C-alpha cells in the first residue's frame, strides 16, 4: 500500500520559539507534542500554504 510523502516543511527557528512554513499539495495533517509531563497535544488539517509558530 503506497502512500505519498509531503515536502520538507520550511523551518526558521527563533529563540524559545519555532516558526515553520507549510507548502501543502493536498490536505494533510500536522501534529506536535512536548516531552515534558504536560503533553499539550495538537492536530489540525492543512489544505493551503500557512505559517505556524
Amino acid at each position: 500500500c503506497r502512500v505519498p510523502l509531503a515536502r520538507a516543511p520550511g523551518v526558521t527557528y527563533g529563540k524559545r520559539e519555532l516558526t515553520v512554513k507549510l507548502h501543502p499539495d493536498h490536505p494533510t495533517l500536522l501534529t506536535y507534542r512536548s516531552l515534558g509531563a504536560d503533553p499539550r497535544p495538537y492536530e489540525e488539517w492543512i489544505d493551503r500554504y500557512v505559517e505556524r509558530t
Binding site: 527557528y13 519555532l18 507534542r33 516531552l35 503533553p39 497535544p41 492536530e43
Partner: protein, 437 residues
C-alpha cells in the same frame, strides 16, 4: 564486590560510574541504556465488529392462517401481516383478496472478516518493564538484557549486576484501552452486559469463537406497501464503521513522555521517566592494582574557552609530573559538570586535554585522576545562539557556585550591608552597657 548506583532513565546518555576500592587502581564503568519497553497486563473483556442483517426471502401463502414461531436467534422481530396483494413481472399470482399471509423475518449476525477486521478491548493493571543495558569497562564492552524488576541478575561476564525496581510506574495506559490495527486509545467502553444502540459496541460479542452474539441494534419491521413484494426493515448504521470514520486523536500522539507504542505485544518504548537503581559485584582480577603506573605527583588545571550548554565546549588542560607512562582513570566527583572521556592514556610529558560540559557559567567541578584530586573552576560565560537538533548530555542543574567569580560582588556587598548593622548593634551594646551602671 557489591556497590550501588543510580542511572537517570534517559536514552542515549552515557553514564560514568566510578569504583574506588582500596588496594587496587580505581576503575570506571560506562553505562548505556537502549530502548526501554513497558508491557502491561491484558484482560480481553469482549470484542466488537460489524454486523450483517440477515433476512430470508419473505413467505407467501394464500390461505389466511398465520404461523408465528419463535426461535433462539438474537433480536427477532416476529410478525406476520395480512391483506397483502403482491405483484411480480407476470402481473400477480393467485386470486384471493383480504385473505392472504405475508411472513417477514430478519435477524443479525457477525461480520465476514470478523477473523481479521475486529477491534479488541483490554484492561490494564500494574505493568512490568524491560530494559536493554550496555556495560563497558577496561577491554570489555557488551550489551545485556534484564527485566529491571525488583531483583534479578544479569551475569554479563566476570562481574554480576542486578537492576533495582522503578521508583514509580507512571504508565501512560490506564484501566481500559482499545487495540485496533497498530494504535490504541484511552477511550472507555460500555460493559459487556448492555450497550447503547448505535454509538459504539452495538455488537458486544466475546472471543472470536462466535458464541452468543449479543445485539441491541433495535431492528424494526413495517407493513409493506400495497404495490409489490417488499421487506421493509429500519436499522441504524453500524457504530463500528462510524467510530472508524470519526477516529481522530490517536493515543500515539498523547504520550506524556513521548513513549512510542508498538502493538504486537502492546508495549510502550523509548520514553524517559524516573530513575533506575542498580547494584553490582565485581571479581578482584577484573582490573589492575595500585603498583601499576602511579604518576600523579602534583596537579593543576587551566581552561582556554568554555562555550557551553550544547554538547561539549569545556576544553581543559591538566599538567603534572609523570612516572613511567601508562593508563589511569579520571572522572569528576560532583555532577555540576560532566565529562565524556573514559580512562585515557598518559604520556611522559603530562599535558592532558579533557572535554567536559555544564550549564552554569561558574562551574566548581572537582576533577579526580586515579590517585589525585584538585578543584577546577572556570568562567564559562559565553553561551551560543542556536536551537540544537541533538540531545543534551549534562544534568539540568544550573546554579552559580558559592565562591564564583561574577557573583562575588553580590556576596561582599551583602556582607558589608550586614556589617553596618552589626557594628551599629555593637556600638548600641557598648552604650547600653555604659549607661546600665
Amino acid at each position: 564486590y557489591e556497590h550501588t548506583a543510580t542511572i537517570p532513565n534517559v536514552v542515549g546518555f552515557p553514564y560514568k560510574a566510578h569504583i574506588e576500592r582500596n588496594g587496587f587502581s580505581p576503575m570506571t564503568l560506562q553505562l548505556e541504556v537502549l530502548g526501554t519497553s513497558l508491557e502491561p497486563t491484558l484482560n480481553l473483556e469482549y470484542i466488537t465488529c460489524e454486523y450483517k442483517t440477515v433476512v430470508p426471502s419473505p413467505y407467501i401463502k394464500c390461505c389466511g392462517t398465520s404461523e408465528c414461531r419463535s426461535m433462539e436467534r438474537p433480536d427477532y422481530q416476529c410478525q406476520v401481516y395480512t391483506g397483502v396483494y403482491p405483484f411480480m413481472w407476470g402481473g400477480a399470482y393467485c386470486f384471493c383478496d383480504t385473505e392472504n399471509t405475508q411472513l417477514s423475518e430478519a435477524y443479525v449476525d457477525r461480520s465476514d472478516v470478523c477473523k481479521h477486521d475486529h477491534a479488541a478491548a483490554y484492561k490494564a493493571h500494574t505493568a512490568a518493564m524491560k530494559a536493554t543495558i550496555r556495560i563497558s569497562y577496561g577491554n570489555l564492552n557488551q550489551t545485556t538484557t534484564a527485566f529491571v524488576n525488583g531483583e534479578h541478575t544479569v551475569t554479563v561476564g566476570g562481574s554480576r549486576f542486578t537492576f533495582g525496581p522503578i521508583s514509580t510506574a507512571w504508565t501512560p495506559f490506564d484501566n481500559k484501552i482499545v487495540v485496533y490495527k497498530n494504535d490504541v486509545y484511552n477511550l472507555d467502553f460500555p460493559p459487556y452486559g448492555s450497550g447503547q444502540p448505535g454509538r459504539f459496541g452495538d455488537i458486544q460479542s466475546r472471543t472470536v469463537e462466535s458464541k452468543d452474539l449479543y445485539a441491541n441494534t433495535a431492528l424494526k419491521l413495517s407493513r409493506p406497501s400495497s404495490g409489490t413484494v417488499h421487506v421493509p426493515y429500519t436499522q441504524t448504521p453500524s457504530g463500528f464503521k462510524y467510530w472508524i470514520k470519526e477516529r481522530g486523536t490517536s493515543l500515539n500522539d498523547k504520550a506524556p513522555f513521548g513513549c512510542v507504542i508498538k502493538t504486537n505485544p502492546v508495549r510502550a518504548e523509548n520514553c524517559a521517566v524516573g530513575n533506575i537503581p542498580v547494584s553490582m559485584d565485581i571479581p578482584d582480577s577484573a582490573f589492575t592494582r595500585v603498583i601499576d603506573a602511579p604518576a600523579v605527583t602534583n596537579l593543576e588545571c587551566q581552561v582556554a574557552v568554555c562555550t557551553h550548554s550544547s554538547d561539549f565546549g569545556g576544553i581543559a588542560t591538566l599538567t603534572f609530573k609523570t612516572d613511567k607512562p601508562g593508563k589511569c582513570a579520571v572522572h569528576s566527583h560532583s555532577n555540576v559538570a560532566t565529562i565524556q572521556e573514559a580512562a585515557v592514556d598518559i604520556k611522559t610529558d603530562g599535558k592532558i586535554t579533557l572535554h567536559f560540559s555544564t550549564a552554569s557559567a561558574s562551574p566548581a567541578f572537582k576533577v579526580s585522576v586515579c590517585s589525585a584530586k584538585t578543584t577546577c573552576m572556570a568562567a564559562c560565560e559565553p553561551p551560543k545562539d542556536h536551537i540544537v537538533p541533538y540531545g543534551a548530555s549534562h544534568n539540568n542543574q544550573v546554579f552559580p557556585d558559592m565562591s564564583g567569580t561574577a557573583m562575588t560582588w553580590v556576596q561582599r556587598v551583602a556582607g558589608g550591608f550586614g556589617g553596618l548593622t552589626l557594628a551599629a548593634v555593637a556600638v548600641l551594646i557598648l552604650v547600653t552597657c555604659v549607661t546600665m551602671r
